[PDB]
Amino acid sequence: YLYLRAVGGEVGASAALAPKIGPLGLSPKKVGEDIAKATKEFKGIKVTVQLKIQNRQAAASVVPSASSLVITALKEPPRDRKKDKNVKHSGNIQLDEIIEIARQMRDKSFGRTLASVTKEILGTAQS
Amino acid sequence: PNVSIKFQALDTGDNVGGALRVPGAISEKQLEELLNQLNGTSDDPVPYTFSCTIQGKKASDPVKTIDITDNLYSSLIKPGYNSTEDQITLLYTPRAVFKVKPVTRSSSAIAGHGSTILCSAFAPHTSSRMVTGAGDNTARIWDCDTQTPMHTLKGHYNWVLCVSWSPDGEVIATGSMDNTIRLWDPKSGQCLGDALRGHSKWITSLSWEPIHLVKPGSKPRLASSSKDGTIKIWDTVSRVCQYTMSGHTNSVSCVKWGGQGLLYSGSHDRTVRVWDINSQGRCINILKSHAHWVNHLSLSMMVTASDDYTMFLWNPLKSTKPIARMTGHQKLVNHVAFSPDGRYIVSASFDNSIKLWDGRDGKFISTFRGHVASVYQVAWSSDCRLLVSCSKDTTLKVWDVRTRKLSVDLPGHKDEVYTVDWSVDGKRVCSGGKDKMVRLWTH
Amino acid sequence: MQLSWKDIPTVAPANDLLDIVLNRTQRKTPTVIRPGFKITRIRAFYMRKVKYTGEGFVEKFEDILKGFPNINDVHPFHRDLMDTLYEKNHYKISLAAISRAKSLVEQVARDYVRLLKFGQSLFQCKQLKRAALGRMATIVKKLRDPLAYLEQVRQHIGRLPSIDPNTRTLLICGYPNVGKSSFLRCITKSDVDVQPYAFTTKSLYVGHFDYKYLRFQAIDTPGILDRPTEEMNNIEMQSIYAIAHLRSCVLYFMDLSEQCGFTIEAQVKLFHSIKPLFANKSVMVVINKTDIIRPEDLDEERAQLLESVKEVPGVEIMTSSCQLEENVMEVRNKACEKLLASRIENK
Numbered sequence: 001y002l003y004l005r006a007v008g009g010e011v012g013a014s015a016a017l018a019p020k021i022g023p024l025g026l027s028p029k030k031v032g033e034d035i036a037k038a039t040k041e042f043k044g045i046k047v048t049v050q051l052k053i054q055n056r057q058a059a060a061s062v063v064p065s066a067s068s069l070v071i072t073a074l075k076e077p078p079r080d081r082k083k084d085k086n087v088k089h090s091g092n093i094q095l096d097e098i099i100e101i102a103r104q105m106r107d108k109s110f111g112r113t114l115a116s117v118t119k120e121i122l123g124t125a126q127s
Numbered sequence: 128p129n130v131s132i133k134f135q136a137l138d139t140g141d142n143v144g145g146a147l148r149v150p151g152a153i154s155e156k157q158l159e160e161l162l163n164q165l166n167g168t169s170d171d172p173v174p175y176t177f178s179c180t181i182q183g184k185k186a187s188d189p190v191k192t193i194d195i196t197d198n199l200y201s202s203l204i205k206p207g208y209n210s211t212e213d214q215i216t217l218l219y220t221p222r223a224v225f226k227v228k229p230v231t232r233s234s235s236a237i238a239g240h241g242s243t244i245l246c247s248a249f250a251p252h253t254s255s256r257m258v259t260g261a262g263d264n265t266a267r268i269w270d271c272d273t274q275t276p277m278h279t280l281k282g283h284y285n286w287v288l289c290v291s292w293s294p295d296g297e298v299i300a301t302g303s304m305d306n307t308i309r310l311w312d313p314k315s316g317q318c319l320g321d322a323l324r325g326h327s328k329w330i331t332s333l334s335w336e337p338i339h340l341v342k343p344g345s346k347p348r349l350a351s352s353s354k355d356g357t358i359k360i361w362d363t364v365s366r367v368c369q370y371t372m373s374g375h376t377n378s379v380s381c382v383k384w385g386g387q388g389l390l391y392s393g394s395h396d397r398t399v400r401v402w403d404i405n406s407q408g409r410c411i412n413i414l415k416s417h418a419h420w421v422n423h424l425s426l427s428m429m430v431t432a433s434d435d436y437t438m439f440l441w442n443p444l445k446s447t448k449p450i451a452r453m454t455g456h457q458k459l460v461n462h463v464a465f466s467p468d469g470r471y472i473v474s475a476s477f478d479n480s481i482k483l484w485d486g487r488d489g490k491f492i493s494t495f496r497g498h499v500a501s502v503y504q505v506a507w508s509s510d511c512r513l514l515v516s517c518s519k520d521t522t523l524k525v526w527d528v529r530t531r532k533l534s535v536d537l538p539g540h541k542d543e544v545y546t547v548d549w550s551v552d553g554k555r556v557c558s559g560g561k562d563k564m565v566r567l568w569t570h
Numbered sequence: 571m572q573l574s575w576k577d578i579p580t581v582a583p584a585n586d587l588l589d590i591v592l593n594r595t596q597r598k599t600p601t602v603i604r605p606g607f608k609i610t611r612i613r614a615f616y617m618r619k620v621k622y623t624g625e626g627f628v629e630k631f632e633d634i635l636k637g638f639p640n641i642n643d644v645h646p647f648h649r650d651l652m653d654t655l656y657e658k659n660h661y662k663i664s665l666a667a668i669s670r671a672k673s674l675v676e677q678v679a680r681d682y683v684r685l686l687k688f689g690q691s692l693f694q695c696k697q698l699k700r701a702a703l704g705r706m707a708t709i710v711k712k713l714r715d716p717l718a719y720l721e722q723v724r725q726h727i728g729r730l731p732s733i734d735p736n737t738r739t740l741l742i743c744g745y746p747n748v749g750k751s752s753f754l755r756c757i758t759k760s761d762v763d764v765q766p767y768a769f770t771t772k773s774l775y776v777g778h779f780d781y782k783y784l785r786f787q788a789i790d791t792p793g794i795l796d797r798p799t800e801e802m803n804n805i806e807m808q809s810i811y812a813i814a815h816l817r818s819c820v821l822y823f824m825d826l827s828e829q830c831g832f833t834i835e836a837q838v839k840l841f842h843s844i845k846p847l848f849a850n851k852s853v854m855v856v857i858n859k860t861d862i863i864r865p866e867d868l869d870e871e872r873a874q875l876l877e878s879v880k881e882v883p884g885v886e887i888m889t890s891s892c893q894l895e896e897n898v899m900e901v902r903n904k905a906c907e908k909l910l911a912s913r914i915e916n917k
Contacts, residue, residue: 012833013831014792014793014796014832015746016831017747017832018745018829018831019746019747026829027828028829028830028832029831029833081327082306082326085306085327086327087324087327088306088327088328088355090367
């Protein structure tokens with residue numbers, strides 16, 4: 001795929017949308033609407049969004065994602081301010097919370113087991 | 128010969144109007160007695176204190192209070208103005224209380240914390256308790272009276288950079304390089320079990336609202352500033368992190384709270400931020416001005432002292448524009464004491480000078496000179512009346528606020544005084560040097 | 571039409587500067603034949619060495635001070651372009667540093683020559699030269715970090731677009747990918763050039779066109795003026811402001827089609843913000859790229875431009891597509907005319 005970068009809430013930037021070409025395979029602000037609607041809350045760190053183009057449609061592959069799932073559950077927007085030791089904000093996820101994030105991920109993830117899936121998310125959470 | 132008097136109130140406080148005429152012969156002590164009768168405050172030990180008639184940069188001194196009113200009427204400073212020479216202008220404000228018989232044997236010293244450093248707390252008034260914090264990773268609660276160590280709080284992983292003390296004196300809070308703040312019971316010397324996580328980097332400063340006037344829904348909280356560039360508000364009773372204030376690019380050196388509603392922060396990113404702590408976590412205003420790092424803060428007015436040696440005074444709460452830029456110090460102002468205290472600010476600087484300022488006017492009331500080296504700390508000891516300053520020159524000096532003259536100086540062969548806390552009765556000084564001892568002076 | 575700023579020569583490092591002086595002094599001493607007293611001859615050698623030590627320092631430091639127009643002295647367009655890169659406040663302390671250093675080396679050189687000249691003791695005379703060299707050596711090293719900052723900037727100022735802010739310029743603005751770069755090349759008779767500039771994504775395209783024996787300069791803004799000024803950093807925000815000194819006329823291109831990847835609403839907002847600020851310079855708004863353009867957007871555009879109702883630059887838009895080369899010369903004459911015919915009569 002031919003990939004692209006995005007900021008939360010952005011539309012119609014000259015540098016980012018125009019030279020990279022407007023998906024929909026023409027007519028930006030088609031996609032410019034589509035990305036923007038989806039994007040969620042405040043901009044923060046940039047995410048990938050990834051472009052795939054079809055006949056007169058655009059689709060984006062967007063994972064802020066499993067970690068943005070963590071943000072919703074904890075009710076904490078940041079990430080680990082002081083890496084791997086102890087976070088500055090006090091975002092301790094519960095054990096019950098993490099298996100439900102794992103349940104939902106289990107389609108996107110390969111994972112064999114639910115217990116396997118819990119490690120994979122937990123490894124993401126700690127760091 | 129008579130005088131007409133015109134008194135207009137200065138600061139929020141008492142109000143009264145009406146000119147009142149008194150005879151000319153009368154002294155200052157008599158003038159206050161006439162004025163206070165009108166004010167409706169009694170002629171009790173309440174001093175009722177005066178400031179006068181705005182100006183005095185001239186060749187001469189301007190308008191002292193204590194000069195007899197007939198003498199003032201002729202010649203205030205000039206003969207006066209066209210609008211004076213007919214009235215005398217008085218600004219009236221309380222405080223203040225007296226302490227009598229000074230005494231003096233050498234202070235008891237309480238050795239502790241080997242060769243170490245940073246914080247001091249003395250609960251003023253009844254509290255005899257003094258709390259010292261150190262890089263040694265511990266804190267010690269001491270008896271101002273006995274001068275013996277009550278306990279040492281040995282929770283922290285590393286160096287203790289800051290502390291807060293409740294007036295009850297029952298609760299102590301500390302900030303450590305270990306990145307956590309802890310709440311302790313000073314009597315027990317027992318960790319509250321309050322270990323507060325969330326800060327990534329060292330917790331440099333904190334201000335605590337010991338008691339919350341507002342309904343119990345709101346409780347007492349402590350705000351902490353960290354190297355991580357963020358501030359957090361914590362519930363002392365239940366050690367939880369109520370809110371996080373993000374937005375500072377650089378480390379947060381100083382913070383003021385107790386505002387109970389306004390969080391004021393000064394950071395290395397040369398910015399001063401005013402915040403709404405409650406469920407929002409949003410910074411309403413960012414004060415821009417300081418060329419360099421903001422070291423110290425006072426929150427009446429908002430006052431910031433910067434490395435760029437300037438002090439800015441910030442106007443009422445919503446607008447975010449600066450009232451005045453106070454210049455004159457050469458170097459970094461370590462600490463300042465500002466308050467509702469007649470809008471009077473005292474600043475201690477590395478330049479080894481101390482200045483008294485009128486925040487409203489912007490005028491420099493006076494500068495205290497005589498210390499050899501940088502001024503580490505200051506307090507308006509007596510009150511409006513006295514200023515106490517500490518320095519490298521091992522000196523804690525007592526100065527006359529009105530005169531800006533130096534009355535007397537405390538220490539000799541030693542090294543230096545890092546900081547001081549003063550109560551009406553006594554002074555506690557944290558000192559450092561090769562042979563160390565905290566000093567407790569009693570008067 | 572050129573840069574004042576190019577002319578300053580590259581500053582040599584402290585390391586290069588330390589070695590060269592001593593080597594030169596070494597060369598000088600053996601070649602010289604002192605005449606006179608034995609003590610005097612040695613003294614003469616040492617004096618010579620001290621003076622080449624002074625000479626070599628003074629020559630490098632003078633090269634920084636000369637070559638260079640001072641940052642304040644140049645016209646407001648040019649001052650700005652330097653300001654972004656170094657920071658002017660950092661630059662004012664830095665200029666003074668060069669001056670201070672020069673004074674000190676002269677002062678020390680004078681001090682030592684006299685002392686040696688004065689002294690009888692051979693050991694002393696030798697030691698004195700030793701001391702001077704030691705002192706000279708420390709100074710260049712201390713200054714190395716300001717030398718390094720100065721040397722780096724010299725190269726960056728040389729790269730600056732060379733254009734005249736006095737004579738009439740036409741400015742192409744609009745959001746990115748609107749077709750401003752293409753519009754410009756079509757407009758210019760000769761082939762387009764590229765000028766490097768700090769804080770521009772593309773660079774700038776510069777072209778020029780004649781009507782009569784009057785020359786008109788054209789530059790496009792890509793990445794600089796194209797997007798919110800407030801949103802940008804303090805250095806880039808300042809870069810946007812340099813454009814103010816520079817432009818005699820501003821042209822606002824709109825691409826209604828959203829081929830640029832940006833909506834008409836966004837383009838109208840950016841235009842409106844810039845527009846009252848430059849009363850002094852003439853405006854011609856052109857809605858180019860007309861052939862592709864969609865009618866849905868046109869309604870939004872129409873509401874600012876054509877309507878007498880709120881927000882309007884008071885200029886009458888030309889439909890064209892310069893890229894297509896329909897009306898390319900027609901639009902070009904009008905743009906020049908709006909500022910030219912004006913300014914002539916005005917002055």
